[PDB]
Chain length 296, copies 4
């Protein structure tokens, strides 16, 4: 069978009613995969070989007991067929170090969803710089004077840290200086400004893309909808780049007809769309994984 | 002429007697390049285009006044032929974000020394996992129990943070637990252990590699020496990988016949080797840059 | 009845088999006090008046359910007769701010165990500077050069942060510099050095003092013992100062015949001594509280 | 003569045109005091005795060279007659530890301006809780829900951290939640809210009080003015408490007829008032110090 590993934040603390990682584990188990649970602290590197302490895992939709460990072992990660990296943000240096550990197992034949080097290349907020055609006006800077000028030009902007804490600075806001100071840590940290998009009142849509192919229903933040014509247009333009970079399960954040963020670490909204619509997103994912496992 | 940009820690605070970045700027100026000075805070990104505020720079070996700005401008980074990224460690998330800014200029034709994606791929302590043949016994972990066992097996080890603060834990040291606790931040951060190498008493050599080719004299930490036979062997084995990854100016740290670290951000020791030996390392670098600029 | 309030770290996470705060709540309940539970976040200040959101609490030695809330209210803290400040270390600025909130209730007649201003005056590591006669050789400094010289003079020393992480630097340790660097954060933070006391092998005794009077049995760290002659001597010398400073429940840490630390925030070891010996430490505490409540 | 010590942030970085500490050193030198310079890192504690490395200092109004050291020594702080604690905020735990070091010298007869225990008792933002009659509506809390309700009741409020970064949240501001989240660090840190005072447009006055006596001219933030009738009223009400707490040189911040903050660490504005008006504030301070030195 396929031996599936998952690296994630502690399973004992999720909400199985909405957790997408758990929805993935149930599908994988329904297909008969052997599942191996691990957290960040379980991964290590010894003389260049990637290894982990895993626990063989069993999961079930039981609100009183949704997982159990039926075994425990130390193995080279190269023994697993596929590892799902499902660690939540922040994207910090520890996340980047775990990426090098997963890449040593990847050189030995393991499929990593998503690809380690692409996780380092494709920042969730800065990767939109590669698709400026699709995005709002975006400025990334440490300088208060540039943030002041962007606010003068656009009148109503969003200020966000790169690593929610979104400030909206409308015309007549008294705090642009304090906010710039706070997010740039007095000019020592980069932050991002975008023009505010009023279409947010119509929904912050979450579109999922499975191996480059958009799932046909999205979740407008919480109401499931079919993709509109402009949703299909954004997703078809990014899709090919996600497939070739090995970004196999991606979330795109779309407000109106603007692409605002690209989630490549732990995209969610599977349960919410699946409940209202006849699509098995977890099934599409595992079909795509299995396809990749036979392509090599 | 070539327009050379440099991103570095503030020039007003260096020691021009030993600073290698300054030694590079003097050579570039001696060849007639137009030099453009910038710090991290000068770089920004607007709708996917990389730009910076630069200052045209003039440098001279004058201990009372070694640089002056003769102009100031805002330009797209794609207007510069080559940018030297010479920012010091730490390798943190800000360093990683600046890397994406330099890579947007790189897609537009600018040569970046060293290549942005390789700066993200090649951690200075963890890239040695790709050359385990050349390195000491190395363990990377968050677990105190694994560090305890490595210390039992090797009797005398080095503990270092990934991001100097090197602890030597010899036989009979009472602090392995406190030290593991301190470097792993009670098991939440990865750290690195290696077996101690007694050949350190003979020197921590600094070998420089310019576009894959080892400079023939190194600095044993501070005494300049010709490369020994095993120094040539280590450097010839890494060299090709550095060239193809676009890691054009690299420092390797060698203790005895063991490779311990790979400096790809801001390697130094140019002045120290150049003073005692008939080699112009800065000249080798600029010849290599100019070669790369005509190869495309 | 007496209305007793307690400020503490979350009750849902303690171990009722050894927690001394819980042992205090059971005694108070056995005497019929009305108990009011609060955490740090429940305390606030409005126009100089101290107030809190409390929960009326019920406790019982049940490992499956040891507490329940039977009510909830917002009141001025001046309505409670006595508040036990049982927040764990660190002693940080938040701890210091909560102290000013408790002191506004104290001006209005509430007894605070221990007294707020004394919690600010009496640091657990630095208050020993007032009893140098009883302590080991102690140096507090940010300077590596002074720590090096103390180590030269004493050969075997203890290095500790002021805010466990105790380093022992014996003769021949290779790390004094790295350790000084780490605890002083490269000379920006004070740390403490003391000469090592070999009598630690015979026990790190925990003596409790209730309103200036030593409890006659201590816990040598884990074995309960009667106080020795030198334990009685140390405790009788500190005792009067603790009583007049309103430090009503204190822990003293004694190694051999040396006083090393003074716990004034959350002293423990009640359950361990009480189990093996015929003393009710919680009863001595509540008798002392009740005495203080009738003395005014 | 009097031997005056000063603990301050590095003298090599001040602006002698406006620095009040420097204005104090010039007056002290004009009276013939022997001046001893020290920074935080110079202070230490050995077996309960407070000591420091001092440098004998000479100062002069020379923009190219305003100070020189004419000697260097290690002494017990009890040898100095008076130490001026002139360390800038933040009020952090290091500031609190230095306070215990200065208090050990104070027990041995040294006058400390301002008194160490009062520096711990009198927080610059929270000490206003003792004079609620004079202050605006003030709430101190970690709870977003209480900050939301204060904003509903007052329509236009100020949010500030306890340890500038003042947020004004007017009617219709979209960010109260993000700001509360940012200043309380998601409910783990206390912050302060006050109702906004429109009289700020007429000036944020800085009144100085020397040993309980108000200096008769203030600086409205930058225009020097005589104290108004309500300025005299606020200062006469606080004054006696400052004198008896040994808070010898204090700054009060007054907006309109409201007391907003009490500066007890490093009050300034001496040069600005002294230039426009016939008062020697430094002379009033040294007369008060000399009076205190003969009162014991």
């Amino acid at each position: 069978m396929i031996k599936l590993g998952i690296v994630m934040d502690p399973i004992a603390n999720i909400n199985i009613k909405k957790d997408s990682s758990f929805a993935m584990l149930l599908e994988a188990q329904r297909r008969g995969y052997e599942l191996h649970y691990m957290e960040m602290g379980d991964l290590y590197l010894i003389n260049g070989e990637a290894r982990a302490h895993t626990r063989t895992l069993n999961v079930k939709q039981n609100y009183e007991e949704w997982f159990s460990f039926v075994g425990e072992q130390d193995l080279p990660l190269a023994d697993l067929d596929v590892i799902l990296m499902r660690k939540d943000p922040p994207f910090d240096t520890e996340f980047i170090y775990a990426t090098y550990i997963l890449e040593r197992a990847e050189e030995k034949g393991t499929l990593i969803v998503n690809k380690p080097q692409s996780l380092r290349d494709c920042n969730e907020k800065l990767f939109t710089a590669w698709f400026s055609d699709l995005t709002p006006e975006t400025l990334v800077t440490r300088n208060k004077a540039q943030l002041k000028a962007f606010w003068e030009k656009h009148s109503d902007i969003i200020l966000k840290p790169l690593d929610a804490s979104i400030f909206r600075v409308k015309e007549g806001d008294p705090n642009l200086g304090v906010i710039a100071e706070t997010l740039t840590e007095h000019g020592t940290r980069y932050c991002m400004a975008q023009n505010y998009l009023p279409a947010i009142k119509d929904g912050d849509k979450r579109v999922l893309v499975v191996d480059g192919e958009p799932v046909p229903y999205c979740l407008a933040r919480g109401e499931p909808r079919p993709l509109t014509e402009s949703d299909w247009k954004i997703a078809r333009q990014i899709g090919p780049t996600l497939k070739e970079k090995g970004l196999i399960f991606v979330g795109l954040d779309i407000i109106g007809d603007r692409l605002t963020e690209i989630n490549v670490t732990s995209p969610t909204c599977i349960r919410e769309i699946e409940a209202e619509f006849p699509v098995s997103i977890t099934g599409m994912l595992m079909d795509a994984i299995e396809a990749r496992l036979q392509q090599q």
